[PDB]
Each structure stands twice: as C-alpha cells, then as structure tokens.
Amino acid sequence: VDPLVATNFGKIRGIKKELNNEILGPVIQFLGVPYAAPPTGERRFQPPEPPSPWSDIRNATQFAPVCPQNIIDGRLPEVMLPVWFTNNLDVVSSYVQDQSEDCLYLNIYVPTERDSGGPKPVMVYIHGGSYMEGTGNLYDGSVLASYGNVIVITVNYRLGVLGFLSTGDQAAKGNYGLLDLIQALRWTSENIGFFGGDPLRITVFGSGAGGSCVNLLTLSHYSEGLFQRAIAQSGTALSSWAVSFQPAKYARMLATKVGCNVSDTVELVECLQKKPYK
C-alpha cells in the first residue's frame, strides 16, 4: 500500500508497482534515494560525502535527475555501447533529458513476498557503456526482483569528466565514480536491512563498462565486507577501454578547451571547479 521505511537519514516513502504479468507479484519502488551528498562546489572532483538527514517523510516515487552527459549523437562510441542502446537513442534520450550535477541517487525494488524465510538477497546493478553516459534508471529491476524474490538496486554515479577526471597527481586522484559506487554500497549495507535485505548477501552485477566496474571493485580493498558476490556480463578490468592510462593528458586538453590550462595542476583543478558543469 503506502511503503514507508525509516532509514538512518530519515523516513522515506515508496510506491507500489504492478507488473504486466499475472504470475509475478507486485513490487515496491523507492526512486531517487540519496546515498551521498551532492558533489557540487568544493565537492567536485572530490570523494563522496554521506547524505544529509531529513526530519519529515521524503518521497521516493520518481527518478532523480541523471548525471551530466551528452548522448544526442555528441560523438559517442558505438563500438562500446550495447546495440539496444545505440539503436534506440530517441527513447534512451528521454531517460537522461533531466540532468544535474546533484545526481548521486539510487533506486530500490522490493518483492512483495517464498519457500525459505528470512532476509532476502540484494542485487546491485552497475550500469555503464563508456563511462561517459547512462543511468541505472534505464534498468527496471521490478521483474527480476519479483520473479527471483530478491532485492534489486540500480545506482547512478558521476560520469565522464565529473566522475573520472585525473591530473595524475594529488590535485585530482580520479575514480570519483567508483567512489560513489563504493559509497552506494556502503549506504546499502547500512540501510538495506530496514527494507528486508541481507547485507551479508550482496551481489554486484553489471554489463559492458558496468561489468568493468564490477571487476575493478573486486580489486579494491574498499569493497571488503561490502558485498560477497559479483556477476560480470560482457565486461572486464583487462580490456583496452576499461581504464584510462593517460588521464593527465586528457585533463589538460579539457583545461585548454575551457581556458584552465595553467602550469600548476592544483590551480588547474580549482579553475575547473569554477566552471559550469555543462
């Protein structure tokens, strides 16, 4: 009916969803749930910070804005993205038309029901085409959750420049997008129990660059105890496009393009932090 759950950060209201299938039971959706603080201002090109609490009932009945991106045939790479994505950009475009730098939100799909009893497993989907675009909002976990009797989570992390820019030194260490994912997993571990999830059985899965993300997370000590299993579909950490080996090179090209190319890498990053994300 009216799905309300109290988390460590406040009360959240969900929304019931019926599936177009008579055997599948309905599900509860929590859309636009903040799992970290907005990466704006001095928090741009910086690790994620925990989200701020709220005292009232926060609504989670609609997707939050997606992270900044330009997929309107803005010279995207077709060889890396899934064919279903590139062959249907008009529909895909509708999912990312509403953008904001404040985009660190996740979505939760909870089944309304089987056999063995106890806390249900949590499956966290990590999307990714080329690290520059996309959103977890494109993947409805309703059926997977309802059919398998598991909790499904989709995550939105900082993309492209905002999520991975690195100067090759301490000015900008990069991997902000990965840190958001780690932070999202942290939030899940700490709050999914309130939704009936098992933090001891968290599985991360993703396809394409999303699959690359999954493997990279398994090589980081930051993932210890966070999750227990991983599923990597058509994506690894060993492919040519999984990692950026010349971040500094591209960081300066961007800076030159926006008038921020100074000798000092620290001043360069501060200059970028003053620029509009667009």
Binding site: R75, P77, V79, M80
Partner: protein, 58 residues
C-alpha cells in the same frame, strides 16, 4: 597455345604475354634416344598502374 612447328628456328613476331612459357626443341634420327633441350621465354612488361583509395574511438 598448341604450337608444334617443324623447323630448326622458332619465330614469334610481336610476342605477347600468353605466348610466353617453356619451349623444348626435340631432335631425333632413329639412332638412340631423341635429343631434347629446354628454354624458358620470359616476356616482360609493365602495364599502367591502378590507383584506388578508401576512407575510414572516433
């Protein structure tokens, strides 16, 4: 080409690519084994070159 000429001299005027190949002169008289000698005629040439071009992440 099917080219059997009874002549101690082989003559091909205005030779062509195809007229090239290996020729053998056979000589017999009844006494013993016929005499054979081989030679490779290697007609040479250089036609006009053809130049084509093709266009072609991101």
């Amino acid at each position: 080409q099917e080219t059997s000429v009874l002549n101690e001299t082989l003559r091909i005027e205005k030779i062509q690519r195809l007229q090239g190949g290996r020729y053998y002169c056979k000589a017999e008289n009844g006494v013993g084994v016929p005499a054979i000698k081989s030679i490779r005629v290697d007609v040479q040439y250089l036609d006009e070159p053809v130049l084509t071009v093709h266009q072609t992440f991101y």
